[PDB]
Copies of this chain bind each other. A is one copy, B any other.
């Protein structure tokens, strides 16, 4: 689930990680 994954990925990023629930897809923005 995006909600679980975004929370986990916050630390890895530290960039913005946003969870889109209805599509169950998460939007990553970061360098390469």
A interface list, Cβ under 8 A from B: 1, 4-5, 7-12, 14, 16-22, 27, 29
In angstroms, how far is the closest chain B Cβ from the Cβ of A24? 12
Interface of chain A, main secondary structure = mixed
Q: Which residues of B contact A10 (CB under 8 A)?
A: 18
B12 and A8 contacting across the interface, CB-CB below 8 Å: no
Copies of this chain, complex-wide, total 9
A27 and B4 contacting across the interface, CB-CB below 8 Å: no
A8 and B20 contacting across the interface, CB-CB below 8 Å: yes
List the B residue with the shortest CB-CB distance to A29: B12
B20 and A4 contacting across the interface, CB-CB below 8 Å: yes
A11 and B16 contacting across the interface, CB-CB below 8 Å: yes
